[PDB]
Amino acid sequence: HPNAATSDVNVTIDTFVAKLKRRQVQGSYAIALETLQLLMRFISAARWNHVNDLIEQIRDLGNSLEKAHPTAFSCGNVIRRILAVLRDEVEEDTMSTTVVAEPLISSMFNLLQKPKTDYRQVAIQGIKDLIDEIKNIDEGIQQIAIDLIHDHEILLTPTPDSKTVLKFLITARERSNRTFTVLVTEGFPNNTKNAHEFAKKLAQHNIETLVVPDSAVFALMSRVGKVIIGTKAVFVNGGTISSNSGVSSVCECAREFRTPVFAVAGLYKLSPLYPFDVEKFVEFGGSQRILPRMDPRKRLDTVNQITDYVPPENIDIYITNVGGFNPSFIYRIAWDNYKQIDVHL
């Protein structure tokens, strides 16, 4: 399913594709915003009449988007949420049209046993809700953040690439009476400059900064107290896609040492589809960025990867804008945002 039905209704699909491919769009937030705008455009223009057909169309669109790009997840998630929002309203409408509804609580056996129209405004409202959810993650976690780390204790911090993580760290640092030391690992071929920037910021912020070469983690692990993953995407079985490079090894080390591993992200980054593999999801960077030369470099096939995956084992807790969820619990949260038929397109 490519572009064929779209005429003088929606054109921006191509622009979106372009943004995805050559990277003029940067940061997950921006992508989410773009997606929201696209959805708005869809809503204000497309022809409705029937409801099931509209739903089908939406599904098709989603499928097309998926086909176009995999590494973007926030975009997908937002769409899914909107679909879910639509679904409840649709159900309500159906219930009115038909006219027992609820026994005590939400119950199973629904998959075995047999279970003019307005919705545009509701769809619009859903988009607004999504926007609100997106607005600020840090303004919703920093109250459950200056609660874990304390005096004379030592942090270990990989991935300063996620914008949330840095902010969280800054919030933690704010206090005048409290004092703590921060270790920051690099992650060379994809995250060095960012790491340097983070270090500089820390220095500026009147805190005891420590520069770490990626090798020297082991000779300081005796003093290590906490581990924070700078993730960008979240999944079904609790797992997370990181904001690129140099996390996995550190996580493994922490696990070996049995040293606390916390996860900071957000529930807009939460996806309703399982990471069936890592190969289809995680992409590789540029082999040219490690070593120069070209003509004798046909022999020198060099390997470098951007994104990182962490198993549903090394992760422990996920404090969100709502609160502290867990790896063996996030499924329900996902369901609460994205509904049954909406997952499979």
Binding site: D14, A18, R22, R293, M294, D295, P296, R297
Partner: protein, 155 residues
């Protein structure tokens, strides 16, 4: 900065491919498992196209068919493919003459000979070109050159 037309020399470097290029046009041959033209088109788009023009020659019917097939053909594209059809067999001077005769020539027009596909972001280059132009009236055309592995050997 904005509104720039694309002119690409096609059907030119035939027989340079020492056995190939005689029945179907030079560019129509499958490159990396899929047609060469497409990559070039993408590159052009990235650079900044407003209308697509190719100087096709060797058996025009097939070229026309390809155009019909292609994605830039129908309304959705910001730029359409309408290839220049001229008398058979001519050099780059002659091609230029033909183009002039045809008429559609602009200020900051883009001319790429053959087929190219690379990575470097072109907006910056364009900006630099503009800046150079703004310096003096006598400035002409832009060259693209890149560094290699110290010593030359496969050249």
């Amino acid at each position: 900065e904005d509104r720039l037309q694309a002119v690409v020399l096609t059907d030119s470097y035939e027989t340079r491919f020492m056995p190939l290029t005689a029945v179907k046009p030079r560019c129509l041959l499958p490159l990396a498992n899929v047609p060469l033209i497409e990559y070039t088109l993408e590159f052009l788009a990235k650079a900044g196209v407003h209308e697509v023009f190719l100087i096709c020659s060797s058996h025009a019917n097939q070229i026309n068919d390809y155009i019909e097939n292609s994605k830039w053909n129908l309304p959705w594209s910001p730029f359409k493919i309408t290839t220049i059809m001229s008398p058979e067999a001519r050099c780059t001077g002659d091609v230029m003459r033909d183009l002039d005769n045809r008429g559609i020539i602009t200020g900051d027009f883009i001319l790429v000979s053959g087929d190219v596909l690379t990575n470097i972001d072109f907006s910056k280059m364009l900006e630099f070109h503009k800046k150079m132009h703004l310096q003096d009236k006598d400035h002409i055309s832009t060259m693209c050159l890149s560094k290699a592995s110290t010593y030359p050997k496969t050249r």
